[PDB]
Coordinates of C-alpha atoms in Angstrom, one line a residue:
Chain A
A1450 CA 100.4 88.2 41.7
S1451 CA 98.1 91.2 41.8
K1452 CA 99.4 94.8 41.5
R1453 CA 99.1 96.9 44.7
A1454 CA 98.2 100.5 45.2
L1455 CA 98.6 102.9 48.2
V1456 CA 96.1 105.7 48.3
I1457 CA 97.1 108.3 51.0
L1458 CA 94.0 109.9 52.6
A1459 CA 94.3 113.2 54.5
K1460 CA 91.8 115.5 56.1
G1461 CA 90.4 117.8 53.5
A1462 CA 90.9 115.4 50.6
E1463 CA 88.5 115.8 47.7
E1464 CA 86.2 112.7 48.3
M1465 CA 85.4 112.2 44.6
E1466 CA 89.1 112.2 43.7
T1467 CA 89.6 109.6 46.4
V1468 CA 86.7 107.3 45.8
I1469 CA 86.7 107.2 42.0
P1470 CA 90.3 105.9 41.7
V1471 CA 89.9 103.5 44.6
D1472 CA 86.7 102.0 43.1
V1473 CA 88.1 101.9 39.5
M1474 CA 91.4 100.3 40.6
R1475 CA 89.5 97.6 42.6
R1476 CA 87.4 96.9 39.5
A1477 CA 90.7 96.3 37.7
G1478 CA 91.7 93.7 40.3
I1479 CA 94.3 95.9 42.0
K1480 CA 94.8 95.4 45.7
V1481 CA 94.2 99.0 47.0
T1482 CA 95.1 100.1 50.5
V1483 CA 93.4 103.3 51.6
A1484 CA 95.8 104.6 54.2
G1485 CA 95.0 107.4 56.7
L1486 CA 97.7 110.0 57.0
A1487 CA 96.8 110.8 60.6
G1488 CA 96.1 107.3 61.7
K1489 CA 93.4 104.6 61.6
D1490 CA 90.4 106.9 62.4
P1491 CA 87.8 107.9 59.8
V1492 CA 88.7 111.0 57.7
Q1493 CA 86.6 114.1 57.1
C1494 CA 86.9 115.0 53.4
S1495 CA 86.5 118.5 51.8
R1496 CA 82.7 118.2 51.3
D1497 CA 82.2 116.4 54.7
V1498 CA 81.9 112.9 53.4
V1499 CA 83.6 110.7 56.1
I1500 CA 85.6 107.7 54.9
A1501 CA 87.1 105.0 57.1
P1502 CA 90.6 104.0 55.9
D1503 CA 91.8 100.4 55.6
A1504 CA 94.9 101.1 57.7
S1505 CA 97.0 103.9 59.1
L1506 CA 99.8 105.2 56.9
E1507 CA 102.2 104.3 59.7
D1508 CA 101.2 100.6 59.2
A1509 CA 100.7 100.7 55.5
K1510 CA 104.1 102.2 54.7
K1511 CA 105.7 99.1 56.3
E1512 CA 103.8 96.8 54.0
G1513 CA 105.3 98.0 50.7
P1514 CA 106.4 98.2 48.1
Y1515 CA 103.5 99.3 46.0
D1516 CA 103.1 99.5 42.3
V1517 CA 101.5 102.9 42.5
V1518 CA 101.3 105.6 45.1
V1519 CA 98.2 107.7 44.6
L1520 CA 97.7 111.3 45.9
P1521 CA 94.2 112.7 45.8
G1522 CA 93.5 116.4 45.6
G1523 CA 91.5 118.8 47.6
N1524 CA 93.3 122.0 48.6
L1525 CA 93.5 121.2 52.3
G1526 CA 94.2 117.5 51.7
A1527 CA 97.1 118.3 49.4
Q1528 CA 98.5 120.8 52.0
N1529 CA 98.4 118.1 54.6
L1530 CA 100.2 115.7 52.2
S1531 CA 102.8 118.4 51.5
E1532 CA 103.6 118.9 55.2
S1533 CA 104.1 115.2 55.9
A1534 CA 107.6 113.7 56.5
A1535 CA 106.1 110.2 56.0
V1536 CA 104.7 111.1 52.6
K1537 CA 108.1 112.6 51.7
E1538 CA 109.9 109.3 52.5
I1539 CA 107.3 107.1 50.7
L1540 CA 107.5 109.3 47.5
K1541 CA 111.3 109.4 47.5
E1542 CA 111.4 105.6 47.9
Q1543 CA 108.9 105.1 45.1
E1544 CA 110.8 107.4 42.8
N1545 CA 114.1 105.6 43.7
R1546 CA 112.6 102.2 42.8
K1547 CA 111.2 103.5 39.5
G1548 CA 107.6 103.0 40.6
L1549 CA 104.5 104.9 39.4
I1550 CA 103.4 108.0 41.2
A1551 CA 99.9 109.3 40.4
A1552 CA 98.5 112.7 41.7
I1553 CA 95.2 114.5 40.8
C1554 CA 93.9 118.2 41.1
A1555 CA 95.9 119.9 43.9
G1556 CA 97.6 116.6 44.6
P1557 CA 100.6 117.3 42.4
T1558 CA 101.6 120.2 44.5
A1559 CA 102.7 117.6 47.1
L1560 CA 105.3 116.5 44.5
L1561 CA 106.7 120.0 44.5
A1562 CA 106.8 120.1 48.3
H1563 CA 108.8 116.9 48.4
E1564 CA 110.9 117.6 45.3
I1565 CA 109.6 114.7 43.3
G1566 CA 109.9 114.3 39.5
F1567 CA 111.4 117.7 38.7
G1568 CA 111.7 118.2 34.9
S1569 CA 108.5 116.3 34.2
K1570 CA 105.5 117.6 32.2
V1571 CA 102.6 117.8 34.7
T1572 CA 99.0 119.1 34.9
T1573 CA 96.9 120.2 37.9
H1574 CA 93.6 121.9 38.6
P1575 CA 93.7 125.3 36.9
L1576 CA 93.6 127.0 40.3
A1577 CA 96.6 125.0 41.5
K1578 CA 98.9 125.9 38.5
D1579 CA 100.7 128.9 40.1
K1580 CA 101.5 126.8 43.3
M1581 CA 102.8 123.9 41.2
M1582 CA 104.9 126.2 38.9
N1583 CA 106.6 128.1 41.7
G1584 CA 110.3 127.9 40.8
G1585 CA 109.7 126.5 37.3
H1586 CA 110.6 122.9 38.3
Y1587 CA 108.0 121.3 36.0
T1588 CA 106.6 122.1 32.5
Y1589 CA 102.8 122.7 32.6
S1590 CA 100.3 120.8 30.5
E1591 CA 96.6 121.4 29.9
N1592 CA 96.0 117.8 29.0
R1593 CA 93.2 116.2 31.0
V1594 CA 95.6 113.4 32.0
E1595 CA 99.4 113.8 31.7
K1596 CA 102.0 111.1 31.9
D1597 CA 105.7 111.7 31.7
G1598 CA 107.5 108.4 32.5
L1599 CA 106.5 107.5 36.1
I1600 CA 104.8 110.8 36.9
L1601 CA 101.0 110.6 36.2
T1602 CA 98.9 113.7 36.9
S1603 CA 95.4 115.0 36.2
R1604 CA 93.2 118.0 36.7
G1605 CA 90.0 117.6 38.8
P1606 CA 86.9 115.7 39.8
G1607 CA 85.7 115.6 36.2
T1608 CA 89.0 114.0 35.1
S1609 CA 89.0 111.4 37.9
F1610 CA 87.7 108.5 35.7
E1611 CA 90.3 109.3 33.0
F1612 CA 93.0 109.5 35.7
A1613 CA 92.0 106.2 37.3
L1614 CA 91.8 104.4 33.9
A1615 CA 95.3 105.7 33.1
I1616 CA 96.6 104.1 36.3
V1617 CA 94.9 100.8 35.3
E1618 CA 96.4 101.0 31.8
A1619 CA 99.9 101.7 33.2
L1620 CA 99.7 98.7 35.6
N1621 CA 97.5 96.1 33.9
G1622 CA 97.5 97.1 30.3
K1623 CA 95.1 98.6 27.7
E1624 CA 92.8 95.6 27.4
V1625 CA 92.1 95.5 31.1
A1626 CA 91.5 99.2 31.1
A1627 CA 89.0 98.9 28.2
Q1628 CA 87.2 96.1 29.9
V1629 CA 86.9 98.0 33.2
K1630 CA 85.8 101.2 31.3
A1631 CA 82.8 99.6 29.4
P1632 CA 80.4 99.1 32.3
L1633 CA 81.0 102.6 33.6
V1634 CA 78.7 104.2 31.0
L1635 CA 81.2 107.0 30.4
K1636 CA 80.7 109.4 27.4
Chain B
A164 CA 66.1 128.9 53.2
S165 CA 68.4 126.2 51.7
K166 CA 67.0 123.2 49.8
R167 CA 67.4 119.8 51.6
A168 CA 68.4 116.4 50.2
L169 CA 68.1 112.9 51.7
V170 CA 70.6 110.4 50.3
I171 CA 69.7 106.9 51.5
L172 CA 72.9 104.7 52.0
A173 CA 72.6 100.9 52.1
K174 CA 75.2 98.2 52.3
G175 CA 76.4 97.4 48.8
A176 CA 75.7 100.9 47.4
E177 CA 78.0 102.0 44.5
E178 CA 80.3 104.4 46.3
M179 CA 80.9 106.6 43.3
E180 CA 77.2 107.0 42.7
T181 CA 76.9 108.0 46.4
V182 CA 79.8 110.4 46.8
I183 CA 79.5 112.3 43.5
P184 CA 75.9 113.5 44.1
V185 CA 76.6 114.3 47.8
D186 CA 79.7 116.3 46.9
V187 CA 78.1 118.1 44.0
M188 CA 74.9 118.9 45.9
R189 CA 76.9 120.3 48.8
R190 CA 78.8 122.5 46.2
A191 CA 75.4 123.8 45.2
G192 CA 74.7 124.8 48.8
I193 CA 72.1 122.1 49.3
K194 CA 71.9 120.7 52.9
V195 CA 72.5 117.0 52.3
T196 CA 71.8 114.3 54.9
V197 CA 73.5 111.0 54.2
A198 CA 71.2 108.5 56.0
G199 CA 72.1 104.9 56.8
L200 CA 69.4 102.4 55.9
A201 CA 70.5 100.0 58.7
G202 CA 71.3 102.6 61.4
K203 CA 74.1 105.0 62.4
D204 CA 77.1 102.8 61.7
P205 CA 79.5 103.1 58.8
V206 CA 78.4 101.4 55.6
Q207 CA 80.5 99.0 53.5
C208 CA 79.9 99.9 49.8
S209 CA 80.2 97.7 46.7
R210 CA 83.9 98.2 46.2
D211 CA 84.7 98.2 49.9
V212 CA 84.9 101.9 50.5
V213 CA 83.4 102.5 54.0
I214 CA 81.4 105.7 54.5
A215 CA 80.1 107.0 57.8
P216 CA 76.5 108.3 57.4
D217 CA 75.4 111.6 59.0
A218 CA 72.4 110.0 60.6
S219 CA 70.3 106.8 60.7
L220 CA 67.4 106.7 58.3
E221 CA 65.2 106.1 61.3
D222 CA 66.2 109.6 62.6
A223 CA 66.5 111.4 59.3
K224 CA 63.0 110.3 58.1
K225 CA 61.6 112.2 61.1
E226 CA 63.3 115.4 60.0
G227 CA 61.7 115.9 56.7
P228 CA 60.3 116.9 54.4
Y229 CA 63.1 117.0 51.8
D230 CA 63.3 118.7 48.4
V231 CA 64.8 115.6 46.9
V232 CA 65.2 112.0 47.9
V233 CA 68.2 110.4 46.3
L234 CA 68.7 106.6 45.7
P235 CA 72.2 105.5 44.7
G236 CA 72.8 102.4 42.7
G237 CA 74.9 99.3 43.1
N238 CA 73.1 96.0 42.6
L239 CA 73.1 94.9 46.2
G240 CA 72.5 98.4 47.5
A241 CA 69.4 98.8 45.3
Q242 CA 68.2 95.4 46.5
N243 CA 68.4 96.5 50.1
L244 CA 66.5 99.7 49.2
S245 CA 63.9 97.7 47.4
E246 CA 63.3 95.5 50.5
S247 CA 62.9 98.3 52.9
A248 CA 59.5 99.3 54.4
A249 CA 61.0 102.6 55.6
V250 CA 62.1 103.5 52.0
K251 CA 58.7 102.6 50.7
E252 CA 57.0 105.1 53.1
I253 CA 59.5 107.9 52.4
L254 CA 59.1 107.5 48.6
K255 CA 55.3 107.3 48.8
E256 CA 55.3 110.5 50.9
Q257 CA 57.6 112.3 48.6
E258 CA 55.5 111.3 45.6
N259 CA 52.3 112.5 47.4
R260 CA 53.8 115.9 48.2
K261 CA 55.0 116.3 44.6
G262 CA 58.7 116.3 45.6
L263 CA 61.6 115.3 43.4
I264 CA 62.8 111.7 43.5
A265 CA 66.3 110.9 41.9
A266 CA 67.7 107.5 41.3
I267 CA 70.8 106.3 39.5
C268 CA 72.1 103.0 37.9
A269 CA 70.3 100.1 39.6
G270 CA 68.7 102.6 42.0
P271 CA 65.6 103.0 39.9
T272 CA 64.6 99.4 40.4
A273 CA 63.7 100.4 44.0
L274 CA 61.0 102.7 42.4
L275 CA 59.5 99.6 40.8
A276 CA 59.6 97.6 44.1
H277 CA 57.7 100.4 45.8
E278 CA 55.4 101.2 42.9
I279 CA 56.6 104.7 42.5
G280 CA 56.1 106.9 39.4
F281 CA 54.5 104.3 37.1
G282 CA 54.0 105.6 33.6
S283 CA 57.2 107.6 33.6
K284 CA 60.0 107.6 31.1
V285 CA 63.1 106.2 33.0
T286 CA 66.6 105.1 32.4
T287 CA 68.9 102.7 34.3
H288 CA 72.2 100.9 33.9
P289 CA 71.9 98.7 30.8
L290 CA 72.3 95.6 33.0
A291 CA 69.3 96.7 35.2
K292 CA 66.9 97.3 32.3
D293 CA 65.2 93.9 32.4
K294 CA 64.5 94.2 36.1
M295 CA 63.2 97.7 35.8
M296 CA 60.9 96.8 32.9
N297 CA 59.3 93.8 34.5
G298 CA 55.6 94.3 33.9
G299 CA 56.0 97.2 31.6
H300 CA 55.2 99.9 34.2
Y301 CA 57.7 102.4 32.8
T302 CA 58.9 103.4 29.3
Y303 CA 62.6 102.9 28.8
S304 CA 65.0 105.6 27.7
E305 CA 68.7 105.4 26.7
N306 CA 69.3 109.1 27.6
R307 CA 72.3 109.5 30.0
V308 CA 69.9 111.4 32.4
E309 CA 66.1 111.2 32.1
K310 CA 63.6 113.4 33.8
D311 CA 59.9 112.9 33.5
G312 CA 58.2 115.4 35.9
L313 CA 59.4 114.6 39.4
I314 CA 61.1 111.3 38.5
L315 CA 64.8 111.8 37.6
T316 CA 66.9 108.8 36.6
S317 CA 70.4 108.1 35.2
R318 CA 72.6 105.2 34.1
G319 CA 75.8 104.6 35.9
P320 CA 79.1 105.8 37.6
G321 CA 80.0 107.7 34.4
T322 CA 76.7 109.6 34.4
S323 CA 77.0 110.6 38.0
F324 CA 78.1 114.1 37.4
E325 CA 75.4 114.7 34.9
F326 CA 72.8 113.2 37.3
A327 CA 74.0 115.4 40.2
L328 CA 74.0 118.5 38.1
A329 CA 70.5 117.7 36.9
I330 CA 69.4 117.6 40.6
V331 CA 71.1 120.9 41.2
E332 CA 69.4 122.5 38.1
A333 CA 66.0 121.1 39.2
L334 CA 66.3 122.6 42.8
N335 CA 68.4 125.7 42.4
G336 CA 68.2 126.5 38.7
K337 CA 70.4 126.5 35.6
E338 CA 72.7 129.3 36.6
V339 CA 73.7 127.7 39.9
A340 CA 74.2 124.4 38.1
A341 CA 76.5 126.1 35.6
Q342 CA 78.5 127.8 38.3
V343 CA 79.0 124.5 40.2
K344 CA 79.9 122.7 36.9
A345 CA 82.8 125.0 35.9
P346 CA 85.4 124.2 38.5
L347 CA 84.8 120.4 38.1
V348 CA 86.9 120.2 34.9
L349 CA 84.3 118.1 33.1
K350 CA 84.6 117.4 29.3

């Protein structure tokens, strides 16, 4: 049985932080569902790339559970994720079943909004640190990718490959991650 | 006046090699037109990400000239670019007006198909080297990004940021490229 991933795509998401993890997870043989927060319609990302989701979140959330729930960044995308009751329920359920939650850039601020994984070490984009740290509910890290148990976080577009390969390693193991990495021509 | 870029998007294109340059060029204030080879409809990329183009190539090609023409990779995407008479005309015109042509991964094999920039140093994805070198019309380089005059090439998904920043440097200068680079959190 293949592992499954839910990637939640909201208006204003950073398109690089969305596409790199989707592509790399699919290279690892993970069944990835790109789910539109607002519905089935294509989504306008932060730099105006328009991506058509595989499903609405409304539909996708009924087809769980998932081995990982992925939250892309982008300031406005993360704000939309943070305001969503559906996202809150999905993340609480994932936390309760001890499943992986992965968030990049401004994405981890949605964990704060929904009170997920308090007491974890986390990283974010440098510009999102103050928002994430409001109330002191996490301990901040400057690592490019941070993993504290089931909370996996990362910093920005330039850490997206490292973030995605960390998800692959967590789900399918180090060897699969190494095999997927090689053809990418990373430095 | 802002610089303009034409990104030609074909079925089977590598979505990371498409989105990273579009996003980074837009961060640099370049007016980027994502043009669908087959028309106006959304395009299914190599790893099944679906991207809606800004225009058909048929329309976009009448709105030139462009300061750069960008060819993403992906084996099947590059094959589609290589078979296109419209792409041939655009590239020949760009070469004739001494404008920049940028191609990544398998993308440079479309230069060979259309007889563009013979005698240049080029790079490609390692797996595309033999196709690119058929006939010995280029000199092969293992640099992560290669630039020989107006022909700019690169190797793969993991060199996409370097490729995009090289386009920005060529069009808008080193300082703009450095300013765009900093918030990306690259290593």
